[PDB]
Amino acid sequence: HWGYGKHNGPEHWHKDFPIAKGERQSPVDIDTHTAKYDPSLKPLSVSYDQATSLRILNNGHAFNVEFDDSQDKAVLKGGPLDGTYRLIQFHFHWGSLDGQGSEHTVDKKKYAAELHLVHWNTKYGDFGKAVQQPDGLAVLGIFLKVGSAKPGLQKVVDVLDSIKTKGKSADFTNFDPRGLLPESLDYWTYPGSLTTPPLLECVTWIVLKEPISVSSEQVLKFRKLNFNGEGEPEELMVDNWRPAQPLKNRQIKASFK
Template identity: 30%
Template sequence: MMMIGNQKISMISISSIMLRFIIILIILHGTAIKCDWNFWWTYDGISGPEFWGILNPDWFLCSKGHRQSPIDIKPGLLLYDPNLKSIFINKNKVNGYLENDGHSVVFHSHYQQQNQSDTFNQQQNHQNSNLMLPVTINGGPLSYSYLFHSLHIHFGLVDSYGSEHLISGFQFPGEIQLIGYNSDLYDSYADASTKPNGLVGIAIFLKQETKSSPEIEILTSQLNQIVYRGQKTIIKSLSLRDLLPDDQNYITYDGSLTTPSCDEIVTWIVINKPLSITKEQLQALRFLMQGDIDVPKAPLGNNFRPTQSINDRVIRTNIEFKQQQQSTTKGKNCPTMKQNVQYEINQKLWNAI
């Protein structure tokens, strides 16, 4: 807090004034330069999440929305829905490229890019055409079929945080998000990304172990090729289906993109069981930088948005917490979902359920 005369001016007010000044300068020079808004937002400072809503008027939902993501999931507030089905991702493996886009590590499939003007992709399409089949996402809480679009990796610079979604205040060191668009209603991701029921987001937590999941090994094996913003590397034969655990327990809610423009068109599915990632793989992620090779800027890590208010949303799950009564058959217990739950964050709360 600063004092000017008899008035107190908060640092956040000063930051807001500075940010508005920067925006005015961009607008004044709009005729001379074409502004790429993706270049301007970050995860900290005066271009961080707290200011996304005023950085660009089109991103007003980042500040004013009521169904924003991510959220802190409270097990005691979950609504068990026995009608929630299993999630289905087909077996098709995908080729594509992994990119450091300055905000995150992103995997783009060649299937999604084959009709676009991405030169990097076009050079690869002819030799990968036999594997360029769509990956579809169905079932779960979804009423439509969704086509896989991209995969994003969020992670922290230390082990105690990194994931976007939380479980009772607990944050994992990382989170993978599979994003798909509604191919039943819309022709493209660009069309679906601002429309009702447009996107699905499947969030899978990353947990540090001595051995990683095979698909995590594929995704992290070439991180040294994308240390700086804009660098890309080819990834082949990635199985998105194998990123999901065998058990089909999950939490679901209606939310938003966790990056600008924060459109509230995402059906989120948070998988109950985390994927394994090694210490060495996490360190490789933490070596990545936000900037290009000439101006590296800060490390890419800590690329997670703070949790948002749940407001009046219903958070559903197919996990049945309550232990069933003992079977009338001697020596047998009725099966219970409780023994399959992977997260035991707040033990007192857990035992009370």
């Protein structure tokens, strides 16, 4: 099935998922000189105080930290969003070397990694119904650069040993996603898609301008994860990022002047 290797990677996805060549695909290059400040944007409200993490799963592509979304506990609202969007999970994309790993790029600049916090529109009742709607999802994207350690990430880093291979999960309750955010909520926004198959075009993308810094040893531990399942030959989980896709006359708006 789909992956990130020569034979099952981004160049192959369109065959099972035709939308791969659609009109609102993600990620994209953010050309800072073409993006326009949008005064009609409301302030962004990230409300992760009551967040109820459940567990962490190696899904054979990345790792997912999952949340209880049966109530309005951790929500994204404001900005380009109408209504309330519930946090369902987060995951990362990263590279084999520090000069690559992010999905979105900024004036062609690739970061070492990128964090995605995934939310669904509560008017649709559940995630599965939301992914049938043009405004069903919102994903908050955050760039990672190598420098000082990120304290709020270490609990995640700590547990990676326990989920080395595809299909492994560990209890991951009481994790606070507020520790993964940069200081500024300045962002670019555009309408886009999931960056993995099924590549559904139901996402409002909100990409933060300010990267977080993570340590060399923190990213190294990401790169020790496996794509393969237990007892299979070792394929290091690295370079699990889709490259930038055609903007196609979409408008990237900036929240900042």
